Amino acid sequence: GSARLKGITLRIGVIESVPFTIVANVITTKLTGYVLDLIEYLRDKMGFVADVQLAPPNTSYTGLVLALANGDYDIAIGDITVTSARREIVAFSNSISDNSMRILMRKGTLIDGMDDLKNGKIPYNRIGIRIGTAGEDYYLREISGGSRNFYPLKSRQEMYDSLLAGIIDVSFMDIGTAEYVTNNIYCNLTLVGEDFDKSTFGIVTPKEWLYAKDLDVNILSLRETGILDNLKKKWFQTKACP
Amino acid sequence: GSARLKGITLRIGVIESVPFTIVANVNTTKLTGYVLDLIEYLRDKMGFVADVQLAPPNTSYTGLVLALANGDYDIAIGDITVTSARREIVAFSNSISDNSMRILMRKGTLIDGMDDLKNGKIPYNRIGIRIGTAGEDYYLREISGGSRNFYPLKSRQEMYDSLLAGIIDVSFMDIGTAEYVTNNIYCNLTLVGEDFDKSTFGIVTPKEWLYAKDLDVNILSLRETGILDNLKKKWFQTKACP
Ligand SMILES: [Cl-]
Ligand SMILES: [Cl-]
Ligand SMILES: [Cl-]
Ligand SMILES: [Cl-]
Ligand SMILES: [Cl-]
Ligand SMILES: [Cl-]
């Protein structure tokens, strides 16, 4: 069957990723960003009580999915890529955004694009990969013939710190946040090559979820009426770096 | 409540739209195109028995969705836009393609983009709109404030004919097929303006369908292994017009 979310409390998993979900320390934590604004649009229209729960530090995206599958959250909202391995254990809403990935490196590194990685120009152990992300999936399929020979990374912060310190030469990142971070935070990091792994982001729900239709109709309505476009402009259309 | 499709017969509704579903006579009917290739890729991986059924000639896209909801088909595969209104009555698989629309017109027409339709450079009735398509919903929301005052079209053929005859000055068309037709068939028609109504195509299924996960996981696997990209290149790269 099916029902509406009105009056229901949803434990909503979120995961730190600027400017999707921005975590500020205050003297407690305040969450802002595209995700929190999206949650408000949905709450206002649908009438659920939002119980927003930030994932622990260093939680990977597959870890968030596994946590929801284990019953730790009711839904999860974020820059979460829809993948076949994830779809085996959870459902996803209609997509909230297209997505693709780019190659991230320190300025001055001599890499022209993905061919350099596939042709063995970079030592595999100097390609940094955040485990439990779709980038890892792409790496294992396309680069290393299934071997985990990358330099493993536990978070975006470790990725940035490692590139800046010359511990790794390159990594992969979703295009939205990659543009955001290189245009606003790390002016000495840059993106190179064509984008790859065209994909989508979706809200994670339980499989065969009672509330699947209600959520999907609402997301599609936000898409159709331009609310998702507005939110994307609000949070992403900014550049600080010279 | 879930099951695998192996050995199950699926009645698969398809709808004429070159080069997704291409219909040829000789008396018998042959179907080819992206959709038919996709069915074969899915059939090979999933092991269902395909009973492919072409929708009757005058069938609209909304008509196809309603027919499925009525039980006339088990799934429908095509260039079928996922919309909030359709999601009320059917479910959709994970997307097989991104989509957006463009304005179609005769070459030489002095239209810069959507503003000229919104400003009134063109009477509302100089705009041809195919009934029962996502384009109709866009027109009613963004152009006419709900008024059904466009020039009504029953098929793509009526659209092309009416533009070529000076009866309408513009229509709307999904970008993949609009590019194909203006690049290979109607060399004197063209596209203008920014794309609009960013959306997705999905396979139509019943709501709360037993087989949802099996189909979704397989679609995503085709996405990840490059098969969807391959199919798109195969059927859409051509440009016959000088
Ligand atoms: Cl979708
Ligand atoms: Cl990423
Ligand atoms: Cl499911
Ligand atoms: Cl999707
Ligand atoms: Cl169309
Ligand atoms: Cl449903």
Automatic annotation (TrEMBL), chain A:
It is found in: Membrane; Postsynaptic cell membrane. Disulfide bonds join C187-C241. L-glutamate binds at D79, T81, R86, R130, A134, D174. It comes from the Eukaryota. This is Glutamate receptor 1. The chain holds residues 457 to 812 of 895 of the full protein. Residues 9-238 form the Ionotropic glutamate receptor C-terminal domain.
